[PDB]
Amino acid sequence: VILLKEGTDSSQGIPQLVSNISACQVIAEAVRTTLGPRGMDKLIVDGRGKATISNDGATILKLLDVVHPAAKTLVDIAKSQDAEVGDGTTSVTLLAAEFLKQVKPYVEEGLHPQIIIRAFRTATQLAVNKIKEIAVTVKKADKVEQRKLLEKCAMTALSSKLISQQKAFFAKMVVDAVMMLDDLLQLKMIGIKKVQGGALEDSQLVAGVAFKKTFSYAGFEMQPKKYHNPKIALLNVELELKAEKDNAEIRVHTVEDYQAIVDAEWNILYDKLEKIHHSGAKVVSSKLPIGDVATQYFADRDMFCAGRVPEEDLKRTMMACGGSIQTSVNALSADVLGRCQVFEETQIGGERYNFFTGCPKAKTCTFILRGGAEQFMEETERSLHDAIMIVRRAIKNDSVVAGGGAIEMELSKYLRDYSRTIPGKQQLLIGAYAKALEIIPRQLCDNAGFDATNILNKLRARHAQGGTWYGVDINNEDIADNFEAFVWEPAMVRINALTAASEAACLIVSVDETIKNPR
Amino acid sequence: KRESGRKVQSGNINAAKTIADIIRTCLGPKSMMKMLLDPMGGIVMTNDGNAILREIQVQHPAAKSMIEISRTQDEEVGDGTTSVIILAGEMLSVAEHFLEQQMHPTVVISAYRKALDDMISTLKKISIPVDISDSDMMLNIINSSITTKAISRWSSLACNIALDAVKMVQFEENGRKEIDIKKYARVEKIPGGIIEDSCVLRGVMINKDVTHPRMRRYIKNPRIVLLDSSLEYKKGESQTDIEITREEDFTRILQMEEEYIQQLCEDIIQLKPDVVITEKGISDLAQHYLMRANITAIRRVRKTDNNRIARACGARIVSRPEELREDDVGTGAGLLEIKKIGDEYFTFITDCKDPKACTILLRGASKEILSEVERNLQDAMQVCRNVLLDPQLVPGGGASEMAVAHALTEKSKAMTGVEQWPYRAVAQALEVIPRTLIQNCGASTIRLLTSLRAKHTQENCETWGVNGETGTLVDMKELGIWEPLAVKLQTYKTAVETAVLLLRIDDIVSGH
Amino acid sequence: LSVFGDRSTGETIRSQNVMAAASIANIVKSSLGPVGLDKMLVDDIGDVTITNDGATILKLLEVEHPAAKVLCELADLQDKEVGDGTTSVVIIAAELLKNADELVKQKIHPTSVISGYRLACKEAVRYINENLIVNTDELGRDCLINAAKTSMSSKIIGINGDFFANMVVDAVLAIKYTDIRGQPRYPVNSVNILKAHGRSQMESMLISGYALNCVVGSQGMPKRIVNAKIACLDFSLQKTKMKLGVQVVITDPEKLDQIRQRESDITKERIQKILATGANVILTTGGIDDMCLKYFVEAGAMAVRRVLKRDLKRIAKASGATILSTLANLEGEETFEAAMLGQAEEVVQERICDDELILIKNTKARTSASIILRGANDFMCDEMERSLHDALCVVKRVLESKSVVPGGGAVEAALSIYLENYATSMGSREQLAIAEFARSLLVIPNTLAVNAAQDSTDLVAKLRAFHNEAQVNPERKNLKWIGLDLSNGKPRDNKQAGVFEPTIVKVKSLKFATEAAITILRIDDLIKL
Numbered sequence A: 001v002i003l004l005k006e007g008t009d010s011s012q013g014i015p016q017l018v019s020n021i022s023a024c025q026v027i028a029e030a031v032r033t034t035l036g037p038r039g040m041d042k043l044i045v046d047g048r049g050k051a052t053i054s055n056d057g058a059t060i061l062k063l064l065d066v067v068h069p070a071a072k073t074l075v076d077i078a079k080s081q082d083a084e085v086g087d088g089t090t091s092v093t094l095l096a097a098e099f100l101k102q103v104k105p106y107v108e109e110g111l112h113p114q115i116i117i118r119a120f121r122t123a124t125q126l127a128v129n130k131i132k133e134i135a136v137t138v139k140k141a142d143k144v145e146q147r148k149l150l151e152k153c154a155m156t157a158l159s160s161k162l163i164s165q166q167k168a169f170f171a172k173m174v175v176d177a178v179m180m181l182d183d184l185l186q187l188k189m190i191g192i193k194k195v196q197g198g199a200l201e202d203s204q205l206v207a208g209v210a211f212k213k214t215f216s217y218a219g220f221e222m223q224p225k226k227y228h229n230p231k232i233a234l235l236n237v238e239l240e241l242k243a244e245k246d247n248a249e250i251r252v253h254t255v256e257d258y259q260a261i262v263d264a265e266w267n268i269l270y271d272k273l274e275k276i277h278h279s280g281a282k283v284v285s286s287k288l289p290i291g292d293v294a295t296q297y298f299a300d301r302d303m304f305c306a307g308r309v310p311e312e313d314l315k316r317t318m319m320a321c322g323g324s325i326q327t328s329v330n331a332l333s334a335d336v337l338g339r340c341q342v343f344e345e346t347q348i349g350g351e352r353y354n355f356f357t358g359c360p361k362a363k364t365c366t367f368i369l370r371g372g373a374e375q376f377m378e379e380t381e382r383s384l385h386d387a388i389m390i391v392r393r394a395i396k397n398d399s400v401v402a403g404g405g406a407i408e409m410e411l412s413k414y415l416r417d418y419s420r421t422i423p424g425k426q427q428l429l430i431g432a433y434a435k436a437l438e439i440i441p442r443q444l445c446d447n448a449g450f451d452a453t454n455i456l457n458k459l460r461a462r463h464a465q466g467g468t469w470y471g472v473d474i475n476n477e478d479i480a481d482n483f484e485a486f487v488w489e490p491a492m493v494r495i496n497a498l499t500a501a502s503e504a505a506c507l508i509v510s511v512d513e514t515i516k517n518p519r
Numbered sequence B: 001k002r003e004s005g006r007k008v009q010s011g012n013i014n015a016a017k018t019i020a021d022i023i024r025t026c027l028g029p030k031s032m033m034k035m036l037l038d039p040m041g042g043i044v045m046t047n048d049g050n051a052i053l054r055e056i057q058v059q060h061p062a063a064k065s066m067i068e069i070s071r072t073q074d075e076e077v078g079d080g081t082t083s084v085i086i087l088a089g090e091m092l093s094v095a096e097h098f099l100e101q102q103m104h105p106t107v108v109i110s111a112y113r114k115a116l117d118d119m120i121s122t123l124k125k126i127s128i129p130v131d132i133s134d135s136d137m138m139l140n141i142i143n144s145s146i147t148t149k150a151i152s153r154w155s156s157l158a159c160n161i162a163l164d165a166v167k168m169v170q171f172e173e174n175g176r177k178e179i180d181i182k183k184y185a186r187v188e189k190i191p192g193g194i195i196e197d198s199c200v201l202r203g204v205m206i207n208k209d210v211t212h213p214r215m216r217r218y219i220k221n222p223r224i225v226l227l228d229s230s231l232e233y234k235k236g237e238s239q240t241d242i243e244i245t246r247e248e249d250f251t252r253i254l255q256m257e258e259e260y261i262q263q264l265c266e267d268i269i270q271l272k273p274d275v276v277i278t279e280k281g282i283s284d285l286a287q288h289y290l291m292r293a294n295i296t297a298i299r300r301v302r303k304t305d306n307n308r309i310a311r312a313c314g315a316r317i318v319s320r321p322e323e324l325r326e327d328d329v330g331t332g333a334g335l336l337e338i339k340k341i342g343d344e345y346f347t348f349i350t351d352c353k354d355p356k357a358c359t360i361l362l363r364g365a366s367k368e369i370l371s372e373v374e375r376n377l378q379d380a381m382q383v384c385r386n387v388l389l390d391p392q393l394v395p396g397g398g399a400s401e402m403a404v405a406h407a408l409t410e411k412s413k414a415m416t417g418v419e420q421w422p423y424r425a426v427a428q429a430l431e432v433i434p435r436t437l438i439q440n441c442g443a444s445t446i447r448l449l450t451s452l453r454a455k456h457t458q459e460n461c462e463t464w465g466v467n468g469e470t471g472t473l474v475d476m477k478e479l480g481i482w483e484p485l486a487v488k489l490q491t492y493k494t495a496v497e498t499a500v501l502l503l504r505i506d507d508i509v510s511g512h
Numbered sequence C: 001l002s003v004f005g006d007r008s009t010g011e012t013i014r015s016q017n018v019m020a021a022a023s024i025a026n027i028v029k030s031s032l033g034p035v036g037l038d039k040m041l042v043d044d045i046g047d048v049t050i051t052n053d054g055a056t057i058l059k060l061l062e063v064e065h066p067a068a069k070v071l072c073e074l075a076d077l078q079d080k081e082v083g084d085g086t087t088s089v090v091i092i093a094a095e096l097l098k099n100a101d102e103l104v105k106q107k108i109h110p111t112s113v114i115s116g117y118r119l120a121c122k123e124a125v126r127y128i129n130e131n132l133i134v135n136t137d138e139l140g141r142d143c144l145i146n147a148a149k150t151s152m153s154s155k156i157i158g159i160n161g162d163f164f165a166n167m168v169v170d171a172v173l174a175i176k177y178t179d180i181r182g183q184p185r186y187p188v189n190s191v192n193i194l195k196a197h198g199r200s201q202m203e204s205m206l207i208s209g210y211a212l213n214c215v216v217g218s219q220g221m222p223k224r225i226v227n228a229k230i231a232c233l234d235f236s237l238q239k240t241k242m243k244l245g246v247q248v249v250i251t252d253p254e255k256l257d258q259i260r261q262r263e264s265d266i267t268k269e270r271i272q273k274i275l276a277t278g279a280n281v282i283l284t285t286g287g288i289d290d291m292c293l294k295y296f297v298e299a300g301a302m303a304v305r306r307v308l309k310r311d312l313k314r315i316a317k318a319s320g321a322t323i324l325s326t327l328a329n330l331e332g333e334e335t336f337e338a339a340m341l342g343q344a345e346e347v348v349q350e351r352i353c354d355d356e357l358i359l360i361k362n363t364k365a366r367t368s369a370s371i372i373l374r375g376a377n378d379f380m381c382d383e384m385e386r387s388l389h390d391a392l393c394v395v396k397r398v399l400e401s402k403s404v405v406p407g408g409g410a411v412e413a414a415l416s417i418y419l420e421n422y423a424t425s426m427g428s429r430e431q432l433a434i435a436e437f438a439r440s441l442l443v444i445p446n447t448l449a450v451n452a453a454q455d456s457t458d459l460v461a462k463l464r465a466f467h468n469e470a471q472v473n474p475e476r477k478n479l480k481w482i483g484l485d486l487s488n489g490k491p492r493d494n495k496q497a498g499v500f501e502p503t504i505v506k507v508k509s510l511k512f513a514t515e516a517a518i519t520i521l522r523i524d525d526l527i528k529l
């Protein structure tokens, strides 16, 4: 009747590790098919009933939330992958579980897990020095300008897509968008907007901030668009006559104050409009909708107004204009006002759009898409976001390696040759570490629908002859030199993915007993 | 179905430990009785370890191998079978070095066979020579088995039976000193008389009775004849049968039966014999021509018993009855006698020498007394055989066990390697023989065994044994609890040979 | 569907066929090698036989399953081809099926596995035959003396290893005779190992000739003879009989006497024809008459009686003489002159303690000798005779087959590196067939390391670490032909240790195991009636 546990969940030994190895593979199976540009997307619905459609590995693991202990160790590695390099959560999640799969029969035969720890620290340290030797610095090779080279890598990334016919036009726009930025490159600075209707040739690139402008109220035939130096105001105040938040209800029984009651309710709107006139804001941007009466106010005062602006586009306008977002109207002064050189109301796509050009802090851009469907523009937005990512990493890091499994099949060949010259327990473990690194060219053939065994048998035969930069091709169903086809990746992200996958595989192997407190 | 791995290494351990736990308390003069339950309700309360495991059926292949290795050991020597199964179960009982340390059995077998060489080397150091020429020293050896028996009233005469039997069978001319009690010392039982009437004669006795008075009663020069062929109707090379149902077939068969036998009997009576001995049977009509010459008819004798007759008189083994000659004579024999002993007739071809053969004649008041002496003398003959095989004794009663286990502890301090850990386990497994002697006496076991090891360390290891009567420790040089060396040599050898066989088994599979 | 049984197809009959075949490998897993463990063979009657030899294990193993019944017939194809190798085929072919079963789950059809295995087997014989050793180094250069010394280490003879290894090396090279076109093999008959009490084990002498364990009897006849004629006969010169079961009739008493006088007179006639041939060496199984031995001590013929029959078959084969069963030539009595006699040089009655032996020297065609194992007691002489017989068959079975290969894990460890580099040279959906063929050959040092009580992850990997350096650079600092010493748990060179295996036991093992793994892998449907 006297128990030591009394509800304490605890177990140790060999099958506690086998239960932790197989529990690691259920997280890798959630992001196994999402690898590659042609990968399958997952459908995740929240508690409210909204379905989310995405194939990004960072968005899948953030909405999984598995209560298993070994599954929580793959979450913070994907969190640290965003801080170390910026992306690569689906690469280190798949690579961590395949390290444990190849050593899973070796644990059951009686081998100690600490010897597998000493092999993972050894082969990963050799993989760091092997990457930097094969990595070549391509800065001014063959006397070609870097603007021509940046259009070549985006052409292969945008190939086999909806805009694969007109990829020559889309490759020149993604290079000039990053070239418009400063030395501090960021994917959040270049925004993508969608305009329904028209062919694919009508896609434009805004040098500044452009938003959807769903303001469909009155205000035509006045409020001229062209301004030399307007004062950009970012508000969050409703300017309607009968607003849901700004009203005045006083209950008197006199007929003299009944004129003053409607006048006091109008004075809430009029004093909020008079403070914008004193501050000198030529353009009025508000999140809440603006009524038809306030549009008649700025029409005679030679100013512009446009409400129903999202708060995401208001913060991008704040980073462009250099001002500040002010909710109230009495604090509206020149400290929070912005400035630009060109502002105009365009008629691209049949609807009205507003955009600023010539900001002093113009570090943000806007990409306008044109097409016959919004889901055509939704997949074009994610493909152009992928086209910006390959261009951005080529400018920051010059020392690059060949992608497409070329650096993974070369690391599998060197670590297999090093294992044959090492006696002891490091031969069967590092040799299993080299075979576990072949899951990146194997899952790239699985998600692309190709023959996974017909390509990988010819890919390893190409590496055995002396091919150091041969990998899989997403367009053709054969192997190709990814260095000649401009399929690149920097050496620093390939190194940091290997030291994160080896650290995530070492944390599972070093755990042998689970302690749970009853509460 | 099938079983392999480490489960059969633990499955054969519990199969041998269950047999050893049954007869563990049946050691010494205070051996506890065991009750066997029959399906018909019968109960036998025998405390003999050979009688317990014989009437118990086993189903395990390792437990079946445990019984037969002691049964063959019972046929070699007549003492020490209980100590084999106890020591074979104790060596495998420490399974902490077999399973918990994840040790392969090859390390254990290399440690067990290396400990086997220290078994023979230690027993020759604690040994003592025996003055076998003095009959008083031989009486102090065989008396350990004559106690609490019905033969103990005649211990001075029963000791002369077994001592004279082993010396005639043992041949000093051959060098190796062979003794085989089963052939050259065939024991026969004769009802009637008393225990004092039983003596030893120098010859071979025939238990065939006398059916006709026309025989040789007293012949001083016995003319013996040996023959291998049969004395019956002539059969052919085929497998036909003989059936006499017609009167015409009864006359033709009997006329051929008489003419062939008279032709056979004319060749043996031309030499004027005294007793005929045929290998096969003798028909009724064959005695009709034989009784006219007054010859004693002896039939149905084995081929193994035939050479003892030929070495007694010096006759020639003749294959066919037509090929007799004058060299088939038994000149030199003492006397031929067909005198009745207790209304049973026995033929005597005894002599006044040692013709490489003997027999034992037992007498008693009832047939239960005849079975009591033959089971006590055969147990006494194999013990005194081991003394004359090698005149060396060891201090018994647990003194030799603590002397051997003391030598293994000092030897293990200089034995380096991984194999020193199962090497020390044999020293604690050999302590189970003085452990059960104190437990059967009723005293405190660990209180006495700890002081037993302290006496074996400082004092001499040849003394300070255990007395299984009072329950305390006595000196083995004062009491006659001395064991033979060849019994204790084969006891530790078989206990290692059992442990090398059960630990080497790693798979049990079926198949006819 | 209404059929006469149950039907089952798909990959579930592939997984059931490899689990039934690999379970038979576990029956012969621990019994591999010279340190193999015994296993109990339970019969249907109730008795059990303790056998550790793997050839007798598979003969008594009865598993009523068609996947296990395939591996039963390869034991009959192994002994009829060479005579050894049997369970090494079973562990290789079952690990071939277990690695191929993982390929079925990895979306590979078995047709690429079957065609990949035949090209991996033919390239395995090519890499073996390019790294062989011709049968030589019989005298002057040791990999022999040291070869038989390892077999002699398990007994008490191994205290003085250099003294007793010289007795078996010169005895193996003495029994060599071509006899067909330059074959040279070694016969199943070997030297006769006798024993005596020569007060220690160091008084053994290498006698270059056969030694008979018989005593001549009388002393007045001279023990040193010079003539070459050797007579062998099986009929007794003692008083003869018609049959042991059929006898002649004797009726009259005086008729019995005159056939005894005729037996004394017909013995005088037979000795006149034996000594007319000049044969002094007289060896008789049935015995020699007492008055007949009187004629031999005056003529000087070396007559030996009560000789064994199996000893006389090696004596008549030595001098090239014919064994005479009966002296009567179907109408009379003759001695068959110049037919049953051989030639020799010298027969000396050497004084050996407790058994004065008869040595023969320089016969016609014998090639055999004798080793006198003089010792102290019967315990040390009986264990040393089986140690000489076990060391004889080790050197015999190697130096027969016309070329040998350093075995004991040296063959399969070198094949695990070459066949992997050959697998990366072909491609065409058969790279994984040959790469798993190299890993399936590693079970031969893997089962040998677990039977040697060593770490199997270290001892197998030490074999591949030395064999890889022979393929990277041809420098002599690379260790080549590294075997596996299971006694000390350390890899050594097989050329220094003398551990050698025939090529036909290594070639036919890889040939039969891949053809057995092909037949089980071709099973995709099960039909029962």
Ligand SMILES: Nc1ncnc2c1ncn2[C@@H]1O[C@H](COP(=O)(O)OP(=O)(O)OP(=O)(O)O)[C@@H](O)[C@H]1O
Binding pocket: A034, A035, A036, A037, A039, A087, A088, A089, A090, A091, A092, A156, A157, A403, A404, A405, A440, A444, A472, A473, A474, A487, A489
């Ligand atoms: N255009 C391309 N052609 C061929 N292979 C490619 C191409 N782009 C990427 N790859 C390969 O796909 C793999 C990554 O696939 P995917 O883009 O689905 O993950 P990821 O988003 O890069 O992961 P992470 O965000 O962790 O870096 C890389 O190893 C790379 O070699």
Ligand SMILES: Nc1ncnc2c1ncn2[C@@H]1O[C@H](COP(=O)(O)OP(=O)(O)OP(=O)(O)O)[C@@H](O)[C@H]1O
Binding pocket: B026, B027, B028, B029, B031, B049, B078, B079, B080, B081, B082, B083, B396, B397, B398, B437, B466, B467, B468, B469, B470, B481, B482, B483
């Ligand atoms: N009074 C005593 N005290 C202690 N030990 C004794 C005493 N008398 C005899 N012994 C010892 O007990 C031993 C007998 O033990 P145990 O009964 O186990 O074997 P056993 O049955 O005689 O052997 P076997 O079956 O071969 O006859 C004898 O060898 C003797 O040395």
Ligand SMILES: Nc1ncnc2c1ncn2[C@@H]1O[C@H](COP(=O)(O)OP(=O)(O)OP(=O)(O)O)[C@@H](O)[C@H]1O
Binding pocket: C031, C032, C033, C034, C036, C054, C055, C078, C083, C084, C085, C086, C087, C088, C089, C407, C408, C409, C444, C448, C484, C485, C486, C499, C500
């Ligand atoms: N002198 C030696 N040194 C080291 N290993 C050896 C030596 N001789 C043989 N071996 C190993 O022992 C194994 C032989 O095992 P075993 O004799 O128990 O069965 P087997 O002969 O393989 O069965 P079968 O008779 O069918 O072929 C071989 O694989 C070989 O590697």
